[PDB]
């Protein structure tokens, strides 16, 4: 009957709703990926900065040890 056609139409309307839901989920994942990427690159730059700082600190400590040992 026409009831079967209407049932098929409602079936497909629900399928379209699921389409929109999954599209939203994928968009959210794509949005999240960029923020993660930015945070990671920024972490990398900060790690580089702190590594340079510690290298300089160790050099200064060695120089201070040299100076104090030789002066005394």
């Amino acid at each position: 009957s026409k009831q079967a056609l209407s049932e098929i139409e409602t079936r497909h309307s629900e399928i379209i709703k699921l389409e929109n839901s999954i599209r939203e989920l994928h968009d959210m994942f794509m949005d999240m990926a960029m923020l993660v990427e930015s945070q990671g690159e920024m972490i990398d730059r900060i790690e580089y900065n702190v590594e340079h700082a510690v290298d300089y600190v160790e050099r200064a400590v060695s120089d201070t040890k040299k100076a104090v040992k030789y002066q005394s």
């Binding site: 994942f29 993660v36 990427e37 990671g40 972490i43 790690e47 510690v54 160790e58 201070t64």
Partner: protein, 115 residues
């Protein structure tokens, strides 16, 4: 695939966070020792027709649901990892600020005792 890439990269971020924490702790200890030494210096579809138009379709949708559950697992793991990273950074903050305070006070003291 998007989720897998995000998870692996967040693991990398956590490792880097641990490394920087260790570096900051070492810096603080070295500066404190130096200051002390200096101080001492001084189904899915209902069946109206059945057929592959409904069977194959609900099989595909069940596979999709399984993948959605896998994404569930990925999301939970990601959330836990980020939760750990937050506290790690929060802990690093105070140590960095205290080290800055120590160096500033040491500079002031050095500029005062000289006259």
């Amino acid at each position: 695939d998007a989720g897998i890439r995000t998870l692996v990269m967040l693991d990398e971020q956590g490792e880097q966070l641990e490394r920087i924490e260790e570096g900051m702790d070492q810096i603080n200890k070295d500066m404190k020792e130096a200051e002390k030494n200096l101080t001492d210096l001084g189904g899915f579809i209902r069946r109206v027709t059945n057929d592959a138009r409904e069977n194959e379709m609900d099989e595909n949708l069940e596979q999709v649901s399984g993948i959605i559950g896998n994404l569930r697992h990925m999301a939970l793991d990601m959330g836990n990892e980020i939760d750990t990273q937050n506290r790690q950074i929060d802990r690093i903050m105070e140590k960095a600020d205290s080290n800055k305070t120590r160096i500033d006070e040491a500079n002031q003291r050095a500029t005062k005792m000289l006259g």
